[PDB]
Structure formats: structure tokens, C-alpha cells
Design an enzyme around this catalytic site. Structure first.
Site, PDB file in Angstrom:
ATOM      1  N   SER B 113       0.833  -1.183   0.000  1.00  6.49           N
ATOM      2  CA  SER B 113       0.000   0.000   0.000  1.00  6.49           C
ATOM      3  C   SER B 113       0.884   1.256   0.000  1.00  6.49           C
ATOM      4  O   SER B 113       1.793   1.361  -0.820  1.00  6.49           O
ATOM      5  CB  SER B 113      -0.940  -0.117   1.172  1.00  6.49           C
ATOM      6  OG  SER B 113      -1.177   1.158   1.749  1.00  6.49           O
ATOM      7  N   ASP B 304     -10.074  -2.705  -4.326  1.00  9.35           N
ATOM      8  CA  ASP B 304      -9.682  -3.739  -3.372  1.00  9.35           C
ATOM      9  C   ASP B 304     -10.287  -3.492  -1.978  1.00  9.35           C
ATOM     10  O   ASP B 304      -9.846  -4.112  -0.997  1.00  9.35           O
ATOM     11  CB  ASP B 304      -8.148  -3.871  -3.310  1.00  9.35           C
ATOM     12  CG  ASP B 304      -7.457  -2.748  -2.547  1.00  9.35           C
ATOM     13  OD1 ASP B 304      -8.163  -1.838  -2.033  1.00  9.35           O
ATOM     14  OD2 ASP B 304      -6.208  -2.795  -2.440  1.00  9.35           O
ATOM     15  N   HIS B 346      -7.597  -5.327  -0.073  1.00  5.64           N
ATOM     16  CA  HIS B 346      -6.425  -4.569   0.353  1.00  5.64           C
ATOM     17  C   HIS B 346      -5.646  -5.278   1.463  1.00  5.64           C
ATOM     18  O   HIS B 346      -4.408  -5.271   1.448  1.00  5.64           O
ATOM     19  CB  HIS B 346      -6.884  -3.200   0.880  1.00  5.64           C
ATOM     20  CG  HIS B 346      -5.781  -2.219   0.954  1.00  5.64           C
ATOM     21  ND1 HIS B 346      -5.172  -1.717  -0.180  1.00  5.64           N
ATOM     22  CD2 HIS B 346      -5.174  -1.638   1.994  1.00  5.64           C
ATOM     23  CE1 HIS B 346      -4.220  -0.858   0.182  1.00  5.64           C
ATOM     24  NE2 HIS B 346      -4.208  -0.783   1.502  1.00  5.64           N
TER      25      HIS B 346
END
Ligand code: 4I1
Ligand code: 4I1
Ligand code: DAO
Ligand code: DAO
Ligand code: OCA
Ligand code: OCA
Ligand code: OCA
Ligand code: OCA
Ligand code: 6NA
Ligand code: 6NA
Ligand code: 6NA
Ligand code: 6NA
Ligand code: CA
Ligand code: CA
Ligand code: CL
Ligand code: CL
Ligand code: CL
Ligand code: CL
Ligand code: MG
Ligand code: ZN
Ligand code: ZN
Lengths: 382, 382
Positions: B113, B304, B346
Site C-alpha cells: 500500500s 480492493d 487490500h
């Protein structure tokens, strides 16, 4: 002018806290955020209530409390019972939801899970009394609670159970009722007895209330003498196969009461024929589901998370009839077993599974309104 | 000794706390309980580490911290930067995982991320330095961090990003970076700066550290004068479309670095062509998923949970090539975009979705070992 002639009393199961007695943050027991059972049914013109009884206590203690919750008055567990198990005879005192309750004025009783067992015991006491209390008051004088007298009929119209472990659960035998977990439960009860606590977890009759000037140290010392630590007079024991069978053996069908059960399934068969929890089973029931689903006896495997199907359908030693969704559920004296709700885990019945988007509020609304319709029809076919 | 000739450094994203800086109860960032990335990869003979950098700070602050985490030393954000944004120039001091890091000794960088953005900025600083700091030290003397000088190459072998918002996210623009939520974030930071706190949420350079003899009242008063409350020098801003585009516009390709991205999708098309979160999207990302999935621009919708597909594939307008799972991922100087991982939200990339039974530990182990294999390939084809 409520639509139902007889009040509906909803009775929570094990661990349940309702109303004023729920912690700061805690799910709404009857309906979660999915369908506010009490508030919505009231808005629609029905007279309904949520009983508040012991979360951790025995079916016996809970059943006495249920009586006083309805009738009003100071809880009396009975002199013989108190002396035999080693706890206080007297408990909390309730305002009473129907102070005029007596033969003739009836109530509908709906129990989720353990609530279903509690409701059976209480009606048993009204109808047949409690012989140890009758004998004790014979021998020793004093007052005996009207609950223990026997000969009270025409006070309950209906008994409806949702995911009730009528025949117990292995989740109790192999986990809930083990030594290590009873200690956890009892420690929580001790703690929430502390002098700053506003919540009653339902074991204060065992000593779990710290006095205002008592130190926590002294409290620990005092309550470790309590019999709670080794007693069977608690929920954990009563939820076991043995514990539930004992209740089955001392209850009987009242021929004037309408009996109905609901049951959910939330497991699926794996390649060896064991049951595993569906995606969607509230995650706190994952392990308990596996323990049940891996039972040696195949017919004890399918489950809702914490109660196997065979336990919830009906008490095993009592008459029942499989019923369709559409049949009026108006037969008296026999357990009317409603078709299993596929995908409903133990807590989907009360709408608190906030992780499960397949179980919608409108579904839950239909389910509860359906129960009320059945109750209305019980009334109409007197 | 180790199977990999260059150390692998894993770099967490926004909100991430690792190692000793994680609260008493808190998920293990790299792998959850599904595959303990650091411990397992070490057991298998790889030299790997988890960086610890600011959870709430800007890509800039994080990138400086990353440098010192690797090299060791006292964090120096730069005189020009400090003066411009209004925070301390100097920050924490790190032991350093590779005190001998310099041109010739390389490292593999893998970012989850926001970690993916931080890694890009730090390479930018090594190679090109920081112009405002170069100019400032020109004008005013002093020492300048070697991080800000430029001219340091042959220090990073590879940049691999997982679910990185290279092009920002609407979940920042429309939620994370709103006034109401910056205040929440900053209040949390103020609180966790209290004098009994053992966790560093990464904004102490803004004054969020209570002194041992300062009252909470005085603390509140002091830090409410901080520039943090209105600054853009923070993660919330950098994660926006604009914030990320600014980083894109000041980065460039390094022809010696192997670049690779992974991306997940955890939404599905509804009637109307909007995206909604799959069952199985970690539930805390439900609303953020909807916000993204209901974008006016259709190609910004699939996501996501918190980052749209188009943001994760590669920085927009940097060179890239769609790559297969099978072929060597051994091209230099170009973003190798791996095929989208279907059903991976995610946080499935880091194994912390404890509610999601479809994403298995063995799967996550394969995923990580796959990255290591690519890294080994990079080494072998130098
Ligand atoms: C801590 C011990 C848990 C062990 C489980 C024992 C078996 C349970 C069988 C049926 C439970 C009866 C009432 C369940 C009510 C659930 C209410 C709630 O979760 O908010
Ligand atoms: C409290 C504010 C939340 C706003 C959300 C903004 C969008 C974020 C996009 C990418 C963020 C970077 C990393 C996510 C790391 C996940 C860490 C964790 O779950 O412990
Ligand atoms: C979520 C909190 C869990 C902490 C468990 C530790 C407590 C052990 C027993 C405490 C008993 C008591 O306080 O009377
Ligand atoms: C679980 C979260 C509890 C929410 C409490 C809100 C407190 C407001 C902000 C506190 C700021 C501070 O304490 O410095
Ligand atoms: C700090 C408050 C503790 C509340 C205990 C919840 C009781 C229950 O699980 O039935
Ligand atoms: C440990 C937090 C609060 C303790 C209150 C003590 C009161 C008393 O026992 O007199
Ligand atoms: C089997 C897992 C039990 C962990 C309990 C506390 C959860 C947390 O702190 O997030
Ligand atoms: C409820 C607060 C408990 C600790 C406060 C610290 C006291 C002090 O600053 O001397
Ligand atoms: C099941 C939730 C119980 C938590 C009770 C509280 O934090 O007040
Ligand atoms: C005896 C006083 C301490 C117990 C109160 C508490 O636990 O907050
Ligand atoms: C009913 C509560 C059970 C907790 C057991 C577990 O989380 O594995
Ligand atoms: C007291 C716990 C702080 C949580 C830090 C975080 O959300 O990253
Ligand atoms: Ca469910
Ligand atoms: Ca997931
Ligand atoms: Cl009576
Ligand atoms: Cl109490
Ligand atoms: Cl250097
Ligand atoms: Cl700190
Ligand atoms: Mg710590
Ligand atoms: Zn008792
Ligand atoms: Zn800064």
C-alpha cells in the site's frame, strides 16, 4: 386495545443482557440493528416485552426469575433449593409486567436458545409445583412461593422456542462446562460484582456483589468460599447433554398449551461426512461448530454454530409433529416442529450477526411477524 | 550464508504498526496469523526485515525515516522542509539494519500500500537528492544529510508494490482527508503522545509528545498551536489523487531497478455498472469500497476495498508492461504489472483478514515465496 389479547414475553438465552442491564456498548439482543423486535412490534400494535433474567444462572434460577419478572415481587428460589445448592434464598425484586397474572389471564412465551428451556421449567412449576419445596414447607412451616405450589393452569397460551438446545449441546459438554471455562465465567461474574458495577450478570445470589466498604482483596477471599465454583446449579451444566436430559425427564406436555420450535442450520457436509461451519456463521461460533460437527454420532453433527439440529427440533422424549410453513400452528400438547431455516446460525435468530449480509432485516421482520401471526391464531382458535 | 545476496526490506503502509511499536493487542502486520512473513522466510534461509516508519506521516517524512531505518542514524527531515512545513528538523534515531549501506551494497524493497509510495520517494532522494535542501545549504551553510545530496546509486535492486495507491484513492479525497477525519487522526496522535505511551504513531515531529512534567491540559494547549492541523505534509493528503499525482510528477525511472506491482480486486459490478464490495472484503472497508465503486468515472470504480485497480496497476504515465504470472519478471526500468488477484482485498495481501476463510495461509505463503523467487531472479540476472 392491543391486537394480541395476551402479552408476548420474549426470553433471552445464556449470556444475554437486555434493556438497562446491558453494558455501555453491547448489541441489542432482540433484533440487533436488523429488526428492533420490541420497538417495531409495538409500533405495529402488539403488546410485547423482553424479560430480563440471569445470564449465567441455572434454568431453575432463571425460571424463578422469569416468574417474578412477569408477576412482580421479590425472587424466591425456595428454601429447600437454596439450602441444597448453597446460595441465597431471596434475590432481586421486580416491578412486574402483569401484577394480575393468575389462572385465566394468559401470556405467550417465546424463548431464544436457553430461554426456551427456562420457559418450559417455569410452566412446569406453575402446573405441577416443586415437590422438594412443598415437602420442606410441610416439615418446617414458613411461606412457600405460589410458584412452587402447583395447580396453576390457564396462565400460558403458548411456548415457542428458537434454536433452543432441548437436548443439550456438545459445545457445553466439551467446552462451556469444563473447569477452565467455568472459572473464566465465574471470574467475570466476580468482577462485574465490583462496587462500581451497574450490570447484573445473574449470579449475585452466590455472593458476587462487593459491599461498598469491602476491599477487592476481601471480596476475592469471601467469594472463593462460595459453592458456585463446584455447583451444577448453573447454565454451563444445564446446557450439557446430561443437564438438558434431566430437564426433559422432569417436564411434561401441558395439553392446553400450543408448542412450536424453530431450528437453524449453518454447517455443511465435508468429504468425510463431518460438518463444518458455513462462511457466514458468526465467527465466534467457528470452533464450537467444528466440535459439534465432528461428533462420533452422525446425527449429532449438523448444527447452527452451537446447537446441533437434533437438540433444537424438540425434547427427544416428548411428542412432536413435523409441520409445514403454511399449516396453522394451532395444535395443542405437541411440539410443532417448523421447517429448518437454511443458512440461519444460532445468532441470526436475534439479528446480531452484523458480519452476515445474506441475513437481511426484512427477512427477520417477516420471521417475527410470522410468529405473531401464529400467536394470533392460537388466540383465535381457543 | 543467506539464500538472497541482498536483504529484503518490507515496508508497511498507512496506519501500520510493527514489531515493538505495536499495541499490546494488535494484528501482526506482515502475514497476520496466516503466514508469518518475517519469521517463516527467515526459517527458510532468507535475510528479510520489516521497516518501522511513521504510520500517519507524509511520504516525505516516511521516506526519510526509511533511509535511517536501513542506514542507522538520527532522522533529519531537512532544514528547508522543517521550516517550510513547521515541524522539527530532527526526529527519532535508529540503530540501522545495514550500517554499511552505500553504492555497491543493494537492498530489495517491497511495499504494501502506501509503503510502495514511500519506497519510490526514498530512491528518488538517493539518486537525485532534494533540490530545496541542496539550495538551502548552498545559501545558508550547515550540514546537509547525504540522503539529500543525490548521486547515490547501486543501492536498491528492486521495487515491488502490493495494492499501492500509486494514483491515490477517493477514499482519501472523500473521507480520509476530510476535516472531520483529520481531526480524529490528529486527536489519536495527540492522545498516544501522552507521557505513559509506549507507542509512536509517527507524528511526534509535530509536537505530539507530552513532556514528563507537563499537564495534559498544557499539552492540549501547546499542540493545538502545531501546524499539523492544517498541513498537507501528512498521509491523509498524500493518499489523495492530487497528493499522489504530485509524487508521480517528481519521480523518474531508474534503469537499474526491477519494478513490479501486484493489485487485487474485491468488488463486483451491480446493475447500473457501479462496483460494490464482495462478501469477504474485510468489513471495515465496506463504506470506502462503495465510495470508490460509485465514482462518476467508470475506470475508477473497481477496487480492493480502499484502492481502485487503476491506482494500483502502476503510476499513471510511467512506462509499464503487463506481465504473466509464469514468465521471469526480470525487466529493468519498467513497471511489470502482475495479473490482478481476484477476490484479494487490500488487507488480504498482508493476511490480516481473519474473517476470510477463502484466503488460506498456504496461498499467502505461496504468494510471498513467489516474490522471493522473483527477487532471486533479479539477483541471478545481474
Ligand atoms: C463462554 C462459553 C460459551 C460456551 C457455549 C455453550 C453452549 C451454548 C448452547 C446454547 C446457548 C443458549 C443461549 C445462547 C444465547 C446467545 C446470546 C448472545 O450470544 O448474545
Ligand atoms: C482513519 C482513516 C481511513 C481513510 C482511508 C484512506 C485510503 C487509504 C488508501 C491506502 C492506505 C495505505 C495502507 C493500508 C495499510 C493497512 C494496514 C492495516 O490494516 O493495519
Ligand atoms: C478482556 C480482558 C481479559 C483480562 C483477563 C485477566 C483477568 C483474570 C481473572 C480476573 C478476576 C477478577 O478480576 O476478579
Ligand atoms: C474508542 C474511541 C473513543 C472515543 C473518544 C473520543 C475522544 C475525543 C478526542 C480525544 C483527544 C485527546 O484525548 O487528546
Ligand atoms: C467492562 C465491561 C464488561 C461487560 C461484560 C459483558 C457480559 C456478557 O458477556 O454477558
Ligand atoms: C483501579 C481503578 C479504580 C480503583 C478504585 C478504588 C476504590 C476503592 O477500592 O476504594
Ligand atoms: C483466538 C484469538 C483471541 C484473541 C483475543 C483478543 C483479540 C484482539 O486483541 O484483537
Ligand atoms: C486518570 C489519570 C491517571 C494518571 C494521571 C497522571 C498524573 C500526573 O500527571 O501526575
Ligand atoms: C460483546 C461486547 C461486550 C463489550 C462490553 C463493553 O465494552 O462495554
Ligand atoms: C474495590 C475497588 C476496585 C474495584 C473497582 C473497579 O474495578 O474499577
Ligand atoms: C462463544 C465464544 C468462544 C470463543 C472461542 C474462539 O474464539 O475460538
Ligand atoms: C491505542 C491503540 C492505537 C491504534 C493505532 C492505529 O490505529 O494504528
Ligand atoms: Ca450468520
Ligand atoms: Ca478479504
Ligand atoms: Cl399465581
Ligand atoms: Cl450488580
Ligand atoms: Cl549513502
Ligand atoms: Cl512516543
Ligand atoms: Mg510498545
Ligand atoms: Zn439455584
Ligand atoms: Zn514533513
Amino acid at each position: 386495545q392491543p391486537l394480541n389479547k395476551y402479552p408476548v414475553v420474549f426470553v433471552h438465552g445464556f449470556l444475554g443482557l437486555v434493556g438497562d442491564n446491558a453494558p455501555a456498548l453491547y448489541p441489542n439482543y432482540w433484533g440487533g440493528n436488523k429488526f428492533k423486535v420490541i420497538e417495531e412490534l409495538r409500533k405495529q400494535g402488539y403488546n410485547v416485552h423482553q424479560a430480563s433474567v440471569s445470564a449465567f444462572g441455572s434454568n431453575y434460577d432463571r425460571a424463578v426469575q422469569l416468574y417474578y419478572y412477569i408477576k412482580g415481587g421479590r425472587v424466591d428460589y425456595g428454601a429447600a433449593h437454596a439450602a441444597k445448592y448453597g446460595h441465597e434464598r431471596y434475590g432481586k425484586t421486580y416491578k412486574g409486567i402483569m401484577p394480575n397474572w393468575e389462572p385465566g389471564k394468559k401470556v405467550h412465551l417465546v424463548g431464544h436458545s436457553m430461554g426456551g428451556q427456562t420457559i418450559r421449567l417455569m410452566e412446569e412449576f406453575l402446573r405441577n409445583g416443586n415437590k422438594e419445596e412443598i415437602a420442606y414447607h410441610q416439615a418446617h412451616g414458613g411461606e412457600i412461593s405460589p410458584l412452587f405450589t402447583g395447580g396453576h393452569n390457564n396462565m400460558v397460551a403458548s411456548i415457542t422456542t428458537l434454536a433452543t438446545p432441548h437436548n443439550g449441546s456438545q459445545a457445553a459438554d466439551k467446552f462451556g462446562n469444563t473447569e477452565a471455562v467455568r472459572k473464566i465465567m465465574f471470574a467475570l461474574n466476580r468482577f462485574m460484582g465490583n462496587k462500581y458495577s451497574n450490570i447484573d450478570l445473574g449470579l449475585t445470589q452466590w455472593g458476587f456483589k462487593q459491599l461498598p466498604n469491602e476491599s477487592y482483596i476481601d471480596y476475592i477471599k469471601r467469594v472463593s468460599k462460595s459453592k458456585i465454583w463446584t455447583s451444577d446449579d448453573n447454565a454451563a451444566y444445564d446446557l450439557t447433554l446430561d443437564g438438558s436430559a434431566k430437564l426433559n425427564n422432569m417436564t411434561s406436555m401441558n395439553p392446553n398449551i400450543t408448542y412450536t420450535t424453530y431450528t437453524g442450520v449453518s454447517s455443511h457436509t465435508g468429504p468425510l461426512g463431518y460438518e463444518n461451519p458455513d462462511l457466514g456463521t458468526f465467527f465466534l461460533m467457528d470452533t464450537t461448530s467444528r466440535i459439534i460437527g465432528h461428533d462420533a454420532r452422525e446425527e449429532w453433527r449438523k448444527n447452527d454454530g452451537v446447537v446441533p439440529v437434533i437438540s433444537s427440533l424438540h425434547p427427544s422424549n416428548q411428542p412432536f409433529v413435523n409441520v409445514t410453513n403454511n399449516e396453522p400452528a394451532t395444535r395443542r400438547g405437541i411440539w410443532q416442529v417448523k421447517p429448518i431455516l437454511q443458512g440461519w446460525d444460532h445468532v441470526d435468530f436475534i439479528g446480531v450477526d452484523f458480519l452476515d449480509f445474506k441475513r437481511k432485516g426484512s427477512e427477520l421482520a417477516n420471521f417475527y411477524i410470522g410468529i405473531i401471526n401464529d400467536l394470533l391464531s392460537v388466540e383465535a382458535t381457543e
